[PDB]
């Protein structure tokens, strides 16, 4: 009983109203964009390597 | 996590910029190369 009551008192202190209008989705979208960029670059690079290999016969 | 993902983005952008740089130098060498008499 004592521990749970103390927890409830603390939770009142934090007071936890409406949800936190906090989101990390912006940085996530940006970082996914960067990963997609490096993916496109690596893809096209694999392609140009294939081409130069062919020519290099 | 915001700071972590920002650092990841910065690393990726740095790698990509250095890539576009090195490949640009190579492309200038080729600009010199693919322009020389193709008479044969």
């Amino acid at each position: 009983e004592a521990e749970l009551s103390a927890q409830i008192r603390y939770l009142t202190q934090v007071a936890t109203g409406q949800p936190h209008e906090g989101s990390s989705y912006s940085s996530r979208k940006d970082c996914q964009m960067a990963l997609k960029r490096v993916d496109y670059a690596r893809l096209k690079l694999s392609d140009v390597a294939r081409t130069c290999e062919q020519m290099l016969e | 996590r915001n700071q972590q993902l920002r650092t990841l983005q910065e690393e990726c952008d740095r790698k990509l910029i250095t890539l576009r740089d090195e490949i640009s130098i190579d492309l200038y060498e080729l600009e010199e190369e693919y322009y020389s008499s193709s008479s044969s």
Binding site: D39, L45, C52, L56 | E11, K15, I23
Partner: peptide, 30 residues
Amino acid sequence: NELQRKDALVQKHLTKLRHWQQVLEDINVQ
């Protein structure tokens, strides 16, 4: 002589492409 110079240039560029390929996909893996 130009043929030799040409395939030399393309081979150098191929080595460079291999290098940067590994680097980029590594940065992706990390």
